[PDB]
Specification:
Belongs to the glycosyl hydrolase 13 family. It is found in: Secreted. It catalyses: Hydrolysis of pullulan to panose (6-alpha-D-glucosylmaltose). Its cofactor is Ca(2+). By secondary structure, the protein is α/β, with parallel strands linked by helices. It folds into 3 domains: about 1-125, Immunoglobulins (Immunoglobulin-like); about 125-545, Alpha-Beta Barrel (TIM Barrel); about 550-635, Golgi alpha-mannosidase II (Immunoglobulin-like). Helix content is about 20%, strand content about 25%. The chain contains 14 helices and 33 strands. The strands form 9 sheets. The protein has an 8-stranded parallel sheet with strand order 23-22-21-16-13-10-25-24. A hairpin with a 5-residue loop joins strand 30 (about 605-610) and strand 31. Helix 12 (about 485-495) runs parallel beside helix 13 (about 535-545). The radius of gyration is 26 Å and the shape is globular. It binds a molecule of 10 linked components (GLC-GLC-GLC-GLC-GLC-GLC-BGC-BGC-...), a molecule of 5 linked components (BGC-BGC-BGC-BGC-GLC), a molecule of 2 linked components (BGC-BGC), beta-D-glucopyranose, alpha-D-glucopyranose (GLC) and calcium ion (3 copies). One calcium ion binds near residues 284 and 285.
């Protein structure tokens, strides 16, 4: 490069990784020093332009040359944004004579952007164990029956005039005639999970567990809560939970673990004593009497048959959060003996909550996604973080969760459907996560990922729940036609991308299943061993991620987007590590010349494909590696 009235986008780069930001999660008193990369001697001037919420105006901070990278290929321009309590957003204006280019969260641009600027949210912190961990999701009843004595039997009890049905382990999940899909139980419980911690924390290596509902409820999924204060008898009791939490936190059976619980706070089941539609309690619920001490916990349009609920389901009456200081906000999160704080406090001390249907939480029966909804979650945050500043908060949202995270006063992250699940699904399987035809090329994939990451602050990005699938969508293995290689590719990408790798029990070995409830089959433990290639790779990958901080909290730079050969290469890097990931989304093999010079990997230095053990030597900024179709290489140094 040179001073030639031309700013070369290729050399330009910046994100909030260690090399470019010395304060990614600053306090009110820490200033943020930014570094921008450009080809050596490529520009003439560069400036940081930031909008400060303090005075609603833009501010200018001319940058100065700071240094060259070890390979003398790039320049690092420096500039500092002053320390203060206010949220700020910035972008860079890069000049080279008569040529100007802009750069922000969405990369280089010819015209000045007005959205996707980088974020600086003082005092906003997301739990680092979440950024650096690997999560494992479990749908309780279908993981492992560790205690058959608490098993729900056929006919044990009935719900809304329908007996429960028990299935032999491994059988189909669909209810037989006379029964209901939501009342089919396989016997999965807490003792079961406790007995299989070794497989989770050692065989795989995951250090975080997220469980679907485990509180008293009549269904098998349990989102129709009957009592948040008691573990459903079928899964055990509260002391069984205490034991499990102790074994999860234990460092004597593997790495230190963390437990995240599903919080269904937008509604309750219709059989919860506060509502008591079927009169299962001597107390009087809202449905039973307009005098009920809990009458105002709900919204009735025409008492008692017509009332607000979750998406029209009468079994899920919607809670009325009213205004600040309301009884409802008290039992859910404000009171020390509320659902949220009870489990966050001893003798439970869980590590976080997954906010179910979080966007709908509101007052008076409205559907949220408004001021009230956001006011509630920001109070929810103070409450949780007041009890444990390291307790994670991850909300369920299928689109852009920027409105619930970009101000650092609500959730730490969100279920990454839009930023991970969908793009990965369409790129590798040619299907969206509902299994309908939807394909995207590599260039598109890379563009989809960049735009979605730009929707969130860096610490949020690094805390997003990235799963290939879950209890509400179809199995990745099913969307791929059983082609286990597509699972390999998915895993390698998932374990090396930005965000919390999240495995939905079964995906690690390639489990199938279509739309609910078929996406909640019982875990086949004969497949749960390294003899299964998917499992072995999963474990291998998890070890690799835990080995390099760069894969968890490092920068991310796109390296190759080849739609012809279907090759995707990106680099994860920081002050100490440079890692080039090369993915082959094609069905045949391809030899790729990886431009590792982009990550400043010195010539003559060696790299190692952590996935095969095979080592390579960097020569002329490149590294040639052969990669099978639907597979990948993780060149690290
Ligand atoms: O062998 C296979 C090979 O061969 C071929 O395959 C063939 C196959 O052989 C054929 O048989 C054939 O099968 C097709 C499919 O048939 C299915 O059966 C049909 C049913 O018979 C029929 O009744 C049904 O019709 C309606 C139904 O009547 C309606 O009532 C309605 O029901 C919806 C839903 O209700 C209940 O859901 C529960 C949940 O289970 C429970 O967990 C909880 O939900 C909570 C969430 O879990 C939690 O995360 C949170 O979520 C909040 C979000 O909610 C909303 O998101 C929705 C989203 O909108 C949906 O798209 C989807 O993703 O679900 C999510 C989650 O709900 C909201 O939008 C978001 O914003 C929120 O964030 O909170 C909630 C609440 O707390 O509670 C709910 C409610 O109580 C039931 O339990 C559940 O089962 C049910 O689905 O809708 C259905 C229709 O949608 O229709 C089905 C299908 O037509 C079988 O069941 C299927 O398994 C089968 O796939 O054809 C196939 C061909 O494909 C093939 O050729 C080969 O390829 C195969 O390999
Ligand atoms: O901060 C630690 C830093 O210290 C040392 O760098 C000093 C340097 O010794 C000073 O000369 C420098 O002062 C000015 C300089 O007078 C001015 O001309 C220059 O203009 C910007 C141009 O900078 C160019 O970068 C480097 C180039 O990459 C090097 O190979 C070459 O030897 O030096 C130049 C800078 O002179 C850039 O490529 C051009 O496009 C720019 O037009 O700006 C500097 C600084 O404002 O101050 C430096 C303090 O940082 C060490 O040499 C350095 O390694 C340490 O990182
Ligand atoms: O979070 C909403 C919105 O915020 C955007 O940041 C700044 C923007 O940089 C500034 O130019 C404008 O005046 O104010 C907004 C904040 O209100 C961010 O760039 C967007 O992506 C984001 O959607
Ligand atoms: O068509 C399916 C094919 O996908 C490719 O990615 C794999 O390398 C092959 O082994 C497999 O047979
Ligand atoms: O369907 C394609 C689009 O899907 C979603 O809206 C993504 O957020 C967007 O980035 C992508 O372009
Ligand atoms: Ca130039
Ligand atoms: Ca059991
Ligand atoms: Ca009653």
């Amino acid at each position: 490069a040179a001073n030639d009235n031309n700013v070369e986008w290729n050399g330009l780069f910046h994100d909030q990784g260690p090399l470019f930001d010395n304060a990614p999660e600053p306090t009110s008193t820490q200033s943020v020093t930014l570094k921008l990369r450009t080809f050596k001697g490529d520009i003439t001037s560069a400036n940081i332009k930031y909008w400060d919420t303090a005075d609603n105006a833009f501010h200018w901070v001319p940058m100065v040359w700071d240094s060259n990278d070890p390979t003398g290929t790039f320049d690092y321009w420096k500039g500092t944004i002053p320390a203060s309590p206010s949220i700020k957003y910035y972008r860079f204006q890069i000049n080279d004579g008569t040529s100007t280019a802009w750069y922000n969260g969405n990369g280089p641009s010819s015209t000045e952007p007005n959205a996707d600027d980088f974020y600086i949210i003082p005092n906003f912190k997301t739990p680092d164990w979440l950024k650096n961990g690997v999560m494992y999701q479990i749908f309780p009843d279908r993981f492992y029956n560790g205690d058959s004595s608490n098993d729900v039997q056929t006919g044990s009890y009935t719900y809304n005039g329908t007996p429960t049905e028990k299935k032999a382990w491994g059988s189909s999940v669909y209810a037989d005639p006379g029964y209901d899909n939501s009342l089919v139980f396989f016997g999965g419980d807490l003792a079961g999970i406790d007995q299989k911690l070794g497989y989770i924390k050692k065989t795989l290596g995951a250090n975080i567990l997220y469980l679907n509902p485990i509180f008293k409820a009549p269904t098998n999924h349990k989102y129709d809560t009957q009592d948040y204060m008691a573990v459903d008898p079928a899964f055990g009791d509260n002391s069984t939970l205490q034991t499990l939490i102790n074994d999860i936190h234990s460092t004597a059976n593997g790495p230190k673990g963390y437990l995240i619980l599903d919080g269904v706070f937008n509604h309750t089941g219709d059989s919860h004593p506060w509502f008591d539609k079927y009169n299962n309690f001597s107390s009087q619920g809202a449905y039973e009497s307009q005098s009920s001490p809990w009458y105002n916990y709900y919204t009735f349009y025409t008492w008692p048959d017509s009332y607000a609920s979750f998406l029209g389901f009468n079994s899920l009456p919607k809670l009325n959060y009213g205004n600040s200081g309301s009884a409802v906000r008290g039992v859910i999160y404000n009171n020390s003996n509320s659902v949220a704080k009870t489990y966050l406090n001893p003798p439970y001390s869980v590590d976080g909550w997954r906010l179910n249907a979080a966007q709908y939480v509101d007052a008076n029966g409205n559907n949220g996604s408004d001021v009230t909804n956001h006011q509630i979650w920001s109070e929810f945050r103070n409450a949780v973080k007041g009890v444990n500043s390291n307790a994670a908060i991850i909300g369920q949202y299928w689109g852009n969760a920027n409105p619930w995270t970009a101000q650092g006063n609500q959730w730490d992250a969100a279920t990454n459907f839009d930023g991970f699940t969908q793009p990965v699904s369409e790129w590798i399987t040619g299907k969206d996560y509902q299994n309908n035809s939807a394909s995207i090329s590599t260039t598109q994939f890379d563009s989809w990922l960049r735009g979605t990451r730009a929707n969130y602050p860096t610490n949020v990005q690094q805390s997003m729940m990235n799963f290939l699938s879950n209890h509400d969508i179809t199995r990745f293995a099913t969307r791929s036609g059983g082609d286990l290689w597509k699972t390999y590719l998915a895993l390698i990408f998932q374990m090396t991308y930005v965000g919390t790798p999240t495995i939905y029990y079964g995906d690690e070995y390639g489990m199938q299943g279509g739309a609910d409830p078929d996406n909640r089959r019982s875990f086949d433990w004969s497949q749960a061993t390294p003899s299964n290639s998917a499992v072995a790779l999963t474990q291998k990958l998890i070890t690799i991620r835990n080995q390099y901080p760069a894969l968890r909290t490092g920068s991310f730079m796109t390296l190759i987007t080849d739609d012809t050969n279907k090759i995707y290469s990106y680099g994860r890097f920081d002050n100490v590590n440079r890692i080039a990931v090369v993915l082959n989304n094609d069905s045949v093999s391809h030899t790729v010349n990886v431009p590792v010079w982009q990550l400043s990997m010195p010539n003559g230095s060696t790299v190692t494909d952590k996935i095969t053990g095979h080592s390579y030597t960097v020569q002329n900024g490149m590294v040639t590696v052969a990669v099978d179709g639907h597979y990948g290489a993780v060149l690290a140094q």
